[PDB]
Amino acid sequence: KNPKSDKFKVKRFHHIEFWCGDATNVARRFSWGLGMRFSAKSDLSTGNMVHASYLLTSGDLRFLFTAPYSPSLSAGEIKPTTTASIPSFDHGSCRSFFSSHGLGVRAVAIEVEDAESAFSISVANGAIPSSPPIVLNEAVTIAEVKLYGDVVLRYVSYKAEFLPGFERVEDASSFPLDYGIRRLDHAVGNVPELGPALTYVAGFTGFHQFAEFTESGLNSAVLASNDEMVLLPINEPVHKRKSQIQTYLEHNEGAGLQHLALMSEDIFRTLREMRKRSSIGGFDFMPSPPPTYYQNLKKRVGDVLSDDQIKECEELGILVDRDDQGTLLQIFTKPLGDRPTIFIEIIQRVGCMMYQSGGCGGFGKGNFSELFKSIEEYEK
Amino acid sequence: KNPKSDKFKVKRFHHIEFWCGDATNVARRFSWGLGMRFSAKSDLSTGNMVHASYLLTSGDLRFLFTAPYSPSLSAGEIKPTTTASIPSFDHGSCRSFFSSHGLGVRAVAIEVEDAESAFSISVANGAIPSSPPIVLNEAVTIAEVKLYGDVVLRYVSYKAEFLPGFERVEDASSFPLDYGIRRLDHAVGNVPELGPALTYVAGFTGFHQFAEFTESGLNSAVLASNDEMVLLPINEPVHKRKSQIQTYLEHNEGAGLQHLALMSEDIFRTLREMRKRSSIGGFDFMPSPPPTYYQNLKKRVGDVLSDDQIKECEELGILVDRDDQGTLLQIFTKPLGDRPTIFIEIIQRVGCMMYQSGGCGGFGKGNFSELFKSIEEYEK
Numbered sequence: 001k002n003p004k005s006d007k008f009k010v011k012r013f014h015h016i017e018f019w020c021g022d023a024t025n026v027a028r029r030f031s032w033g034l035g036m037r038f039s040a041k042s043d044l045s046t047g048n049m050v051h052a053s054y055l056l057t058s059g060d061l062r063f064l065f066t067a068p069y070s071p072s073l074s075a076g077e078i079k080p081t082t083t084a085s086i087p088s089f090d091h092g093s094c095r096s097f098f099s100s101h102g103l104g105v106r107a108v109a110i111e112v113e114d115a116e117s118a119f120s121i122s123v124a125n126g127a128i129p130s131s132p133p134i135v136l137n138e139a140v141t142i143a144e145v146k147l148y149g150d151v152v153l154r155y156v157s158y159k160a161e162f163l164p165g166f167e168r169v170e171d172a173s174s175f176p177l178d179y180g181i182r183r184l185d186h187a188v189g190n191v192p193e194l195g196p197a198l199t200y201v202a203g204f205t206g207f208h209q210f211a212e213f214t215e216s217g218l219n220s221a222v223l224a225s226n227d228e229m230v231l232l233p234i235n236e237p238v239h240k241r242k243s244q245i246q247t248y249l250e251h252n253e254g255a256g257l258q259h260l261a262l263m264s265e266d267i268f269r270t271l272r273e274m275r276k277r278s279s280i281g282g283f284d285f286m287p288s289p290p291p292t293y294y295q296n297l298k299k300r301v302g303d304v305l306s307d308d309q310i311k312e313c314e315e316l317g318i319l320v321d322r323d324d325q326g327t328l329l330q331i332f333t334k335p336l337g338d339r340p341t342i343f344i345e346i347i348q349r350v351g352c353m354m355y356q357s358g359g360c361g362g363f364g365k366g367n368f369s370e371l372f373k374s375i376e377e378y379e380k
Numbered sequence: 381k382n383p384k385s386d387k388f389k390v391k392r393f394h395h396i397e398f399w400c401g402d403a404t405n406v407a408r409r410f411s412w413g414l415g416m417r418f419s420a421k422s423d424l425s426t427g428n429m430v431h432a433s434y435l436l437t438s439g440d441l442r443f444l445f446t447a448p449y450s451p452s453l454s455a456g457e458i459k460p461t462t463t464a465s466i467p468s469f470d471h472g473s474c475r476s477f478f479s480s481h482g483l484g485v486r487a488v489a490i491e492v493e494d495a496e497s498a499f500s501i502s503v504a505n506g507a508i509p510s511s512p513p514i515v516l517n518e519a520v521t522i523a524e525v526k527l528y529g530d531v532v533l534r535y536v537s538y539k540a541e542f543l544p545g546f547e548r549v550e551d552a553s554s555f556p557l558d559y560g561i562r563r564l565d566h567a568v569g570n571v572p573e574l575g576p577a578l579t580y581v582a583g584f585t586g587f588h589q590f591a592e593f594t595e596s597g598l599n600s601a602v603l604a605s606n607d608e609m610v611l612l613p614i615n616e617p618v619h620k621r622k623s624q625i626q627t628y629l630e631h632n633e634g635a636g637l638q639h640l641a642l643m644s645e646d647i648f649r650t651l652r653e654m655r656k657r658s659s660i661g662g663f664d665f666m667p668s669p670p671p672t673y674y675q676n677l678k679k680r681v682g683d684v685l686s687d688d689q690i691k692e693c694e695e696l697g698i699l700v701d702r703d704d705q706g707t708l709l710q711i712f713t714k715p716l717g718d719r720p721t722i723f724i725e726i727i728q729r730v731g732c733m734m735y736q737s738g739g740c741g742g743f744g745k746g747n748f749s750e751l752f753k754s755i756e757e758y759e760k
């Protein structure tokens with residue numbers, strides 16, 4: 001059941017922020033690979049002497065890419081006089097994050113009714129503060145607490161266009177790419193120990209348990225907001241083969257964000273667009289499951305997807321899972337950067353109409369075993 | 381004249397190495413933006429636990445992109461047992477370079493007849509050593525000396541496929557992009573003081589002076605090898621407006637590589653391909669000169685380019701210059717990464733046939749004044 005125990009009012013996922021070495025090159029690659037439009041900037045051309053920040057959007061999904069300039073450019077600034085548009089930014093914190101983890105998510109940002117209250121209530125309830133509430137242009141409020149490793153949960157609230165200090169991009173370079181991605185479905189963390197992480201985060205949010213999974217690799221559990229639109233799964237390693245969660249922890253130098261699942265309104269169109277671009281600057285995908293996996297498909301989702309929809313899953317390497325309430329189409333990219341750490345999931349859910357309920361169809365845990373068997377079935 | 385005073389045998393430009401935060405994302409962006417094929421790799425999948433290195437090629441042009449892994453992955457290695465394919469690499473040097481300069485060229489690499497001799501002769505003649513000669517798999521030899529700032533000149537020689545330890549990419553991800561770029565024409569450095577830099581480099585190479593320029597921004601001079609195929613211009617600031625060389629030095633935190641000029645066998649095809657991709661992950665170009673610039677074109681190169689070739693220059697924003705021996709088509713990108721530092725020039729030269737002689741048509745110094753006047757002519 002859903003106890004609806006949120007200690008403050010959470011509205012939805014707002015944005016994800018990557019900390020980069022060069023924000024330009026990462027953002028250009030992600031834009032082309034995922035079909036996200038360049039929609040706002042904050043950099044030297046807008047008067048920001050501290051950091052370069054570029055925002056990509058597709059539907060409601062917002063990806064922010066931030067890198068530091070030379071500290072010499074802002075050596076005369078103090079926090080009261082800063083040109084930074086994100087006043088929680090720090091040159092040394094950013095360099096230390098990137099040197100330790102490589103390219104990765106620094107901030108999981110959620111929109112709340114009041115960011116200052118959500119911060120106070122969180123820290124009162126055990127959250128480790130990262131950046132106190134700061135009010136931008138008397139219009140937006142931002143605050144940050146630690147989530148896991150060097151990832152922060154960022155609260156944002158509005159009185160009433162991304163952030164103050166960001167300039168809209170609607171010019172020539174704002175080409176309207178769109179491969180169908182529409183919003184962030186869930187954001188998954190890897191930690192060394194699940195219990196303490198779950199206890200910590202659920203303690204300061206009031207998020208309730210949504211699901212759990214406990215025999216190849218990991219144990220996980222999901223925290224959700226009251227309407228279960230904000231979904232934060234957390235994984236730990238399970239010590240034949242070496243845990244992929246452990247591989248993550250070793251190459252990331254500890255806990256951090258493992259994958260972002262992005263909802264598509266038409267996953268077949270998204271995967272056709274993304275796959276056409278894999279070899280020309282885009283993203284590569286994990287190897288497709290054997291044909292045996294797609295033979296077992298008609299017997300499990302033949303009532304949900306036509307033979308034509310099923311055959312299109314096989315062309316594209318799409319995975320399908322199903323619980324008692326919904327059906328799930330999913331697929332995974334290879335890692336986004338140099339290290340075998342963060343990757344992206346594309347998903348589309350069918351069912352649970354009331355709008356669609358969060359988590360409709362689960363998270364594809366059934367595909368672990370469905371993949372292990374269909375692999376052994378094709379070796380024959 | 382050309383004294384042909386090379387203190388060792390230089391053959392040609394071999395490659396350019398970028399030091400990055402994430403080599404994957406920079407290399408994917410450059411590949412798509414410039415039309416360069418992914419042709420070799422050295423990373424975790426090849427057994428390199430130290431650095432990720434990806435090589436792009438177009439014609440004879442080779443761009444190498446390298447980033448460090450976590451040092452923990454190779455904590456048990458020593459230089460005699462290293463898994464690095466480029467043994468001059470150092471984690472701390474790479475992080476310090478990138479944190480200080482952002483994305484930029486670390487190595488200008490030239491092919492010589494014998495890299496060990498070229499290193500010895502260079503250091504004997506005043507070169508500051510960076511990495512002593514190392515022989516890779518008894519097949520290739522590599523050595524490095526300081527060029528300017530934190531840029532090194534890298535010598536490479538072969539007894540007889542890029543480097544030992546690199547695996548060829550000819551698979552699916554090796555899509556054969558090609559927009560016409562064929563080789564590196566020249567590589568330009570910015571320093572605070574031209575004289576000492578010129579004296580230093582010409583001292584240890586024997587490269588001779590090829591050209592010079594001394595009233596908007598800079599003074600420069602060109603060093604060339606005996607056949608004038610290796611061309612290394614160096615700029616210094618000239619202290620109405622602020623020197624763009626000084627802007628470079630401030631945002632780069634000192635001297636470094638300013639621009640790479642890449643020869644195209646068909647600059648009109650290259651610029652059409654690159655411009656179609658500017659807004660979808662590729663490179664942006666500097667703003668085009670006014671129509672007045674292209675009206676003055678028929679009167680200066682009307683004997684070299686048809687009215688149709690001239691009008692195509694205007695569509696594409698291409699600049700044209702001409703000395704007593706050749707004609708030059710050129711254009712400049714905006715900076716390649718976050719900072720207003722490094723950028724790329726595309727060029728194509730017409731004339732000086734004997735093969736074509738290096739530097740045929742000069743370097744476009746006439747376009748500075750030709751641009752200043754044609755701008756004032758269009759304000760009218």
Ligand SMILES: CCSCc1nnc2c(C(=O)Nc3nnc(C)o3)ccc(C(F)(F)F)n12
Binds near residue numbers: 221332367
């Ligand atoms: C490149 C790694 S591929 C292996 C792999 N990695 N993650 C997954 C997931 C997944 O997202 N689980 C999840 N998300 N939130 C919760 C809670 O649980 C489903 C299926 C597979 C697969 F094994 F079927 F591919 N995965």
Ligand SMILES: CCSCc1nnc2c(C(=O)Nc3nnc(C)o3)ccc(C(F)(F)F)n12
Binds near residue numbers: 747
């Ligand atoms: C984004 C900056 S645009 C301004 C600009 N920056 N560099 C140039 C060059 C140039 O490459 N000179 C050179 N190369 N080797 C030597 C020696 O000399 C020619 C023309 C112009 C221009 F002013 F005409 F554009 N430039």
Ligand SMILES: [Co+2]
Binds near residue numbers: 188259345363
């Ligand atoms: Co998932």
Ligand SMILES: [Co+2]
Binds near residue numbers: 743
């Ligand atoms: Co040039």
